[PDB]
């Protein structure tokens, strides 16, 4: 909107109140929008016995199509925007603008792959709060979108050549970060909740759980398949809650034709790490904390007192 001449501003995408605000907003959206038939949340505050809160309510079968949200300045504040096309999200931004609002952000709730988001304008970008810390998530921003077509009939398709090209680009960025002599290896999720072990997302109001092993099973810069990759998926009724610790149960599908196509525009990864003087790095699909999803879009914005 308005470029600030000769201004340097520090950003920290990992400590950004716009992320927290968006998070609470999306939680609220889901309350009024995608109601389960039963929800369970624990309560073990007492000195002994636990007391699970159980709620049973009407659970209408509805469609669910994320719509873009624009965040504008909250009373008393201004939104600053970093214009540097390849900004890692933490540090001095030399080219900063004031804006009325953010661009339109689709609040897609998903694990592992980030869908329908914004692409990097130059090269693929990787962002972490601490790359040296193996327990911190790496946010990947693609510069080219890869299509993923899913169906309630139990599978998602990805073009193998496009995905291969995508992995090579990501691996190049990873070895630029962790050492150019390193072999880069992608492996499946090492375990945890189903929403985290699979590529998990919602399509036509239904929760999909796609086995992503075929997407993350390759070795790069080591030595000197089928047209489409087909991921087997399951739609489920009993879901772990992303909003807070708990479980929700939904009714079975009513549509015999659930189809959607998304653009993969980023990824959430974790590095294995550990004491292993073997020149190679292992990366697995991650996610689960939806604040990371919001950060993948909000990394370039900041709210400040005026």
């Amino acid at each position, epitope marked *: 909107e308005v470029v600030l001449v000769n201004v340097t501003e520090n950003f920290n995408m990992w400590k950004n109140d716009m992320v927290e605000q968006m998070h609470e907003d999306i939680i609220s959206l889901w309350d009024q929008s995608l109601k389960p038939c039963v929800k369970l949340t624990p309560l073990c505050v007492g000195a002994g016995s636990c007391n699970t809160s159980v709620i049973t*309510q009407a659970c209408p079968k509805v469609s669910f199509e994320p719509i873009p949200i624009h965040y504008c300045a909250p009373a008393g504040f201004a939104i600053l925007k970093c214009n540097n096309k390849t900004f890692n999200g933490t540090g001095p931004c030399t080219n900063v603008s004031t804006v009325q609002c953010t661009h339109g952000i689709r609040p897609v709730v998903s694990s592992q792959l980030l869908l329908n988001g914004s692409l990097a304008e130059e090269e693929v970008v990787i962002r972490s709060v601490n790359f040296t810390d193996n327990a911190k998530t790496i946010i990947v921003q693609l510069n080219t979108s890869v299509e993923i077509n899913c169906t309630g009939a139990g599978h998602c398709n990805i073009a193998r050549a496009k995905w291969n090209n995508t992995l090579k680009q990501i691996a190049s960025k990873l070895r630029e970060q962790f050492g150019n002599n390193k072999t880069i290896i992608f492996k499946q999720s090492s375990g945890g909740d189903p929403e985290i072990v699979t590529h998990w997302f919602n399509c036509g109001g239904e929760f999909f759980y796609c086995n992503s092993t075929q997407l993350f099973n390759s070795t790069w810069f080591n030595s000197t398949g089928s047209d489409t990759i087909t991921l087997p998926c399951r739609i489920k009724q*009993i879901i772990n809650m992303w909003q807070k610790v708990g479980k929700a149960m939904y009714a079975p599908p009513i549509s015999g034709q659930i189809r959607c196509s998304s653009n993969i525009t980023g990824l959430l990864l974790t590095r294995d790490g550990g004491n292993s003087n073997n020149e190679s790095e292992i990366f697995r699909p991650g996610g689960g904390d939806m604040r990371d999803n919001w950060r993948s879009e909000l990394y370039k914005y900041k709210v400040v007192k005026i």
Partner: antibody
Amino acid sequence: EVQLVESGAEVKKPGSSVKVSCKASGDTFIRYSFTWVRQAPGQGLEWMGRIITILDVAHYAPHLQGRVTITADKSTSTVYLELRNLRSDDTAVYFCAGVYEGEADEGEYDNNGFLKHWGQGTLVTVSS
Amino acid sequence: DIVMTQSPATLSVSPGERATLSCRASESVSSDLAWYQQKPGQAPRLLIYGASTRATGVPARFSGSGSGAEFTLTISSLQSEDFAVYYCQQYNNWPPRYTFGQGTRLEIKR
């Protein structure tokens, strides 16, 4: 397929409570939901309530709410019905029934309301 | 409170002939409707669920039809073992408050 074997006949004074049980054998317990249905002599079937075993959540008939509790013991594959503050008109045969819900342990749940498998019934006589 | 009504209360049928049983709901229950058979001293037996789907072990002569608020159980040719009481059951509501009809007694006409 599950076999449902119920506990023996009960005789109670009005004002007492009763706890009847139903042992489920032969399949995976948590993939089933269980329901209790009673039948007064000469009368029809009356739905009392149903427990979603995997969630440990039970729902009850309105006229019964307050004084009925349905529980399940996963470790012994047993379902329980407790009826409190018994009245002479609670005299009935009590049936445990059940139905397969899908791979509940893998988050698949059809929430079926019909009843495929039935216990042999337990007579509960409530009288002075 | 969804009320299920069955008619008639007693149906008299000559052996080997057709029997038609009626179940009506006080409001729509879509296709969430089950039919049971009960003989004296025994537990009910599931014949039909989803209004028209035969349960395993149920002979082809049993047939369920209808949706919404009106349902029919048809037995195309009565065998000796088909004479019993028949109940319908609605399971459409949520929270569940499932209800039964008061039954139709099918007896031998002589």
